[PDB]
């Protein structure tokens, strides 16, 4: 019984929890770098264009 419970918990952690978190980390990385960093350069580039 104890081994069954522990194996269920371990399998759930391996399959559900970690594979739930890692996409969340990837989406958070993409949202910050893929958008905010790109916008910051674009904003500054447009400002430099205005100055020129």
């Amino acid at each position: 019984l104890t081994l069954d419970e522990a194996i269920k918990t371990t399998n759930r952690r391996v399959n559900a929890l970690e594979n739930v978190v890692k996409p969340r980390l990837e989406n958070t990385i993409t949202y910050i770098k893929g958008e905010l960093d790109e916008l910051e350069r674009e904003d500054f580039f447009r400002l430099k264009k205005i100055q020129g």
Binding site: D4, I7, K8, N11, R12, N15, A16, G34, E35, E38, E42, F45
Partner: protein, 463 residues
């Protein structure tokens, strides 16, 4: 007729930066006028005038700005937008990215010069696709079928056999036959393909003997990145001439649409335009529309343009901007799974994300069977339940599959084993495959089936 004029040759080139060549003192420029630039060395390359302001002109050269001298290069303004000399004789030949004949053959004698990026069809005159297609592969035809005029791409990550699938479809392409002059003529765009893939395409097409009805627009990765953007335009313009202006149905194929997306990204980053998601241009939706949104059937003409693009998820992610916008525009998806490839299945078509938004009209009584829709819906829906059962078995154990869940698991196993798999040259007919599809649906009890009514399949009979 209005008297002709020789194009003015300028030498006032007064600035080069990136891929953009600046000019000054231009006398009466024209937007998107094609200009061929002759360098001081004498070599010539083409280019378009992107922005026209005052008497200036910001030209985007094609073969690259390298070798352009601000006091020895000459630019000639033809005064006309880019035009592809389409002709009926163009069939059975191979052309470069811009259209240079590369089959050691004489150039095209144009029946009519036609401008690329032709105007849209008045949607009042637009009609609806109403006929199925016999490509020669079972799983695409049986479920998420393709209509004669329907656009639908292939989603397949890098390294997958999607090129082989495209070649097999093109070689085995044909009408349902339920005629040869109007039979499928295939325009085969090739944006950013490898040299080995190019030789493979040429040899495979020459081997099937259907060179008489197939046109190759090859554009290697060695060719300039901007020249890849005009390859789909030229291919679709030639397809438009063949279909609407000559009659024969055209099955347009474009490989590596992700390469076209990369070309768009490079060109946009060159001019420093407003970036959408993942740094792609903010107008990529409109460009992918102007590429894709030409498949269809026009009312007054008997032609039909069927579109079968081939995308490639970069990180094997459906959320990437290119496949996402495509799925927004492309009216359906035929999906290819790497996981099924790991199981050594030659046509790794995963049917769970694959749906044809026009299948509801391709099916009917004129073709197929009256139980097509319900059987397709069941083999589409029970796969998800089988996947859920597999996940539950993985996270709990083999004992979790009850008298009902184990049935779903067996359904999934047999569905992945027999139904999806097919021969590398097997032309599996619909009814012979639909019998096995019915058997797969009948693995589950004939009363637990919720969505399908029993009578629909009961009209059909086994053996």
């Amino acid at each position: 007729e209005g008297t002709l004029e020789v194009a003015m040759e300028y030498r006032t080139v007064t600035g080069v930066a990136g891929p953009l060549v600046i000019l000054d003192k231009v006398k009466g420029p024209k937007y998107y006028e094609i200009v061929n630039i002759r360098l001081g060395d004498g070599t010539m390359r083409r280019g378009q005038v992107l922005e026209v302001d005052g008497e200036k002109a910001v030209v985007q050269v094609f073969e690259g700005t390298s070798g352009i001298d601000n006091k020895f290069t000459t630019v000639q303004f033809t005064g006309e937008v880019l035009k592809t000399p389409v002709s009926l004789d163009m069939l059975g030949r191979i052309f470069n990215g811009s259209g240079k004949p590369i089959d050691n053959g004489p150039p095209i004698l144009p029946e009519a010069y036609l401008d690329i990026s032709g105007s849209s069809i008045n949607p009042s005159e637009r009609t609806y696709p109403e006929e199925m297609i016999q490509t020669g592969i079972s799983t695409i035809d049986v479920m998420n079928s393709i209509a004669r005029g329907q656009k639908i791409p292939l989603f397949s990550a890098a390294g997958l056999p999607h090129n082989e699938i495209a070649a097999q479809i093109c070689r085995q392409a044909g009408l349902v036959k339920r005629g040869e002059e109007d039979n499928f003529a295939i325009v085969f765009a090739a944006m950013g393909v490898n040299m080995e893939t190019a030789q493979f395409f040429k040899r495979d097409f020459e081997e099937n003997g259907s060179m008489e009805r197939v046109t190759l627009f090859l554009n290697l990765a060695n060719d300039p990145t901007i020249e890849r953007i005009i390859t789909p335009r030229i291919a679709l313009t030639t397809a438009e001439y063949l279909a609407y202006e000559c009659g024969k149905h055209v099955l347009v194929i474009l490989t590596d649409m992700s390469s076209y997306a990369d070309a768009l990204r490079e060109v946009s980053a060159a001019r420093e335009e407003v970036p959408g998601r993942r740094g792609y241009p903010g107008y990529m939706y409109t460009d992918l529309a102007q590429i894709y949104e030409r498949a269809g059937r026009i009312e007054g003409r008997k032609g039909s343009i069927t579109q079968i693009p081939i995308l490639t998820m970069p990180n094997d992610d459906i959320t990437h901007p290119t496949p996402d916008l495509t799925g927004y525009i492309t009216e359906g998806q035929i999906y290819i799974d790497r996981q099924l490839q790991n199981r050594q299945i030659y046509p790794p078509i995963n049917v769970l994300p694959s749906l044809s938004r026009l299948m509801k009209s391709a099916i009917g009584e004129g073709m197929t069977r009256r139980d097509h829709s319900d059987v397709s819906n069941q083999l589409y829906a029970n796969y998800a339940i089988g996947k859920d059962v597999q996940a539950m078995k993985a996270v709990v154990g083999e004992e979790a599959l009850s008298s009902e869940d184990l049935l779903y698991l067996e359904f999934l196993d047999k569905f992945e084993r027999k139904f999806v798999a097919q021969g590398a040259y097997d032309s599996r007919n619909i009814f012979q495959s639909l019998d096995l599809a019915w058997t797969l649906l009948r693995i589950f009890p004939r009363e637990l089936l919720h969505r399908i009514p029993g009578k629909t399949l009961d009209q059909y009979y086994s053996r």
